[PDB]
Design a binder for this molecule. Structure first.
Ligand code: HEM
Ligand code: HEM
Lengths: 374, 374
């Protein structure tokens, strides 16, 4: 009962680094918003930089109030508990271009490459600025998102936005169990544990050798992918076929040759026929760090459901979010493996949006990106 | 703590009448889906009737399993508590036309009139068939909706669908408190209490005098309105101005001349100037049964958030749902008062979708609409 109620009844840890929204338990709901600087503030790099400073300071001041007290009285969230409300601010490479700070762009903020399976909509890609807003309650989330967007109106425009969800802690039979996605799969098993030195090695940017790039010291890079799931096709597969696509069992989450969710995926194991226990094209084989020269990431994603598009196909799937110190040793080589080496999951998924954001560490009395912008 | 956990941890009352989804505590989430019979089943009224019988029986059988056991293993909801999952089935007047049952249409199923403030999109209006799916958890809801839509694929097509939300019970400081909407207003105060004879008088269809219409005995009629809120304009009003628009206080929900949420709205009360305490154009004045020759309804609505449309304006608002025994003595005269007599709330709202559905009573070993269709 205590763990069923904790997420909805407690505030987030506002001191979590680099910013709230990476460590700790992930709340049940997310709103991911990508913003562009308004066309009216782009006369020159100076007017763009002043706009960026205005909105980043405004968001930081409001985030501090939201973390400490919640959405104000007179909002949709009046009368509700803090529900683990957390606000994360991210900066796109395009922001640095727009404000005349190209020489401050770290190598890790390089644009993501195209991949062979991309079906990306340009209006769902990129963005100068990111807000990731999380909460255990949708009304707390809605009230915070409304306030934060209102603070941005004169300097920015919403480029794209997506709401996502997981199960709520209150509805979990076992509150410590790994969540499932819309394909019914246990989702998150192989993430590095947060109390582990592997977590910081995976998530935190490498200390800059160029002081122009040191504004990202202690920060992390977020890759977002909007991945539609082909759920009608997936529904046609029986359970053994679904498990062959993934490499893990649907009921237990165990690797196909194991017995428990936490048993290791043994990529060298062979069955009685001499063929691999984990199929050659199984998702967990091709995504494994062992298949990618050690590339690793922290996946903290959400499901989304946008209803039905005009052609009648369901638009629902995975709001994929991966955290790493450098996309070149995380998302990028792994996604190249999935795209080029024939991940069986490619038959049931479509990457339709994409963005990369730099998420700097919080600093006392300073707003995210201040030492970049000012 | 017990009331914070009850909605997420308990099944719905599957024996609630006319069907689940009207009485009891309303779950935090809803998915409203409107379906049309597929164009391929409309050769004649006989092929349409056979399609209707197929999908209604399929939905009823699946609803029985969902109410008793929840979404199956191998779905997104595996490992979750029942979360008050409830499924309601409704029938549109257009269904009765399509299956050759025009003489079975009760007078109360007459099409809603146009109102002077309508801004309705035709693709967001009407429908042959309704599913209202509710749950306290979004993954339980998503899994049930997926199964129910899958059961409908060969006979129907989704016409429109909208997901809605309230606060979760787990996040309520006071779990018995009335919910708020996206304008921050306390929403639901004047509803008839469920343990009250007024509730059944308000919600339940009047016993038919024509046996051809008796299939709706014990049922209710649902009016759905998709009402966009002009939240950016609303944000410009100070609190006294917001309260003047509504007629009730933002902090307490009391009528302007009262002290407590439950104090009566005294429409005859005058201030020291001789003017009404409750303004002449306040929403709660024009919506009051006293202003409408006793017309009354049971409002069981949800908030929605569909992001931003192509013109950049936020598409969020109220998924209005009103239950009554006859729209002519419920929704219709009240909406005519709001539209024609200048409700101040008209300045901040836009009705963009609309539907009327007949929701018949459940019967032992029979599916909703069986005695109409067979
Ligand atoms: C909708 C698309 C996807 C689905 C449904 C999906 C699902 C899953 C599932 C169920 C697992 C096993 C449990 C776990 O360890 O988390 C897994 C593992 C993993 N996935 Fe995905 N995934 C998707 C896309 C991606 C993408 C785009 C990437 C990276 C580019 C990725 C990287 C990984 C990694 C690194 C692992 C852990 C492998 C290991 O070390 O054992 N996934 N995925
Ligand atoms: C987005 C649009 C609307 C909003 C924000 C809104 C909000 C409210 C609020 C805050 C109350 C007071 C608390 C309560 O008694 O529930 C109220 C009362 C009421 N509303 Fe609305 N409403 C909207 C649209 C409508 C519509 C379309 C109808 C019917 C056609 C309606 C019918 C009523 C009724 C009957 C009452 C109770 C009046 C009484 O007996 O005191 N409302 N509404």
């Amino acid at each position: 009962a205590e763990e069923r109620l904790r997420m909805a009844g407690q505030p987030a840890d506002a001191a979590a680094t680099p910013q709230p929204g990476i460590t700790g338990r992930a709340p049940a709901f997310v709103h991911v918003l990508s913003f562009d600087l308004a066309d009216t503030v782009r006369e020159n790099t100076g007017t763009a930089r002043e706009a960026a400073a205005t909105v980043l300071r405004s968001w930081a001041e409001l985030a501090t109030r939201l973390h400490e007290d919640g959405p104000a009285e007179g909002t949709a969230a009046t009368g509700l508990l803090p529900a683990s409300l957390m606000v994360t601010v991210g900066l796109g490479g395009s922001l640095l271009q727009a404000i005349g700070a190209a020489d401050r762009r770290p190598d890790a903020l390089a644009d993501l490459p195209e991949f062979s399976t991309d079906e990306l909509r340009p209006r769902w890609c990129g963005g100068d600025l990111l807000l990731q807003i999380g909460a255990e309650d949708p009304m707390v989330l809605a009230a915070a998102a409304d306030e934060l967007v209102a603070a941005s109106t004169r300097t920015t425009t919403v480029r794209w936005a997506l709401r996502g969800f997981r199960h709520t802690a209150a509805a979990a039979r076992n509150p410590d169990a790994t969540p499932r996605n819309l394909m019914g799969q246990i989702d998150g098993t192989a993430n590095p544990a947060q109390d582990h030195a592997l977590f910081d090695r995976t998530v935190t940017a490498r200390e800059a050798r160029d002081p122009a790039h040191a504004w990202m010291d202690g920060g992390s890079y977020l890759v977002i992918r909007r991945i539609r799931m082909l759920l009608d096709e997936w529904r046609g597969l029986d359970v053994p076929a679904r498990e062959r696509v993934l490499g893990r069992r649907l009921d237990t989450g165990a690797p196909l040759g194991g017995r428990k969710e936490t048993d290791p995926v043994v990529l060298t194991a062979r069955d009685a026929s001499g063929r691999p226990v984990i199929p050659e094209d199984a998702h967990v084989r091709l995504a494994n760090p062992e298949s990618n020269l050690g590339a690793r990431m922290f996946r903290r994603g959400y499901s989304y459901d946008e209803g039905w598009r005009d052609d009648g196909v369901r638009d629902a799937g995975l709001l994929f979010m991966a955290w790493q110190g450098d996309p070149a040793t995380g998302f990028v080589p792994v996604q190249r493996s999935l795209a080029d080496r024939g991940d069986a999951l490619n038959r049931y998924t479509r990457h339709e949006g994409s963005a990369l954001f730099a998420v700097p560490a919080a600093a006392r009395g300073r707003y995210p990106g201040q030492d970049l912008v000012e």
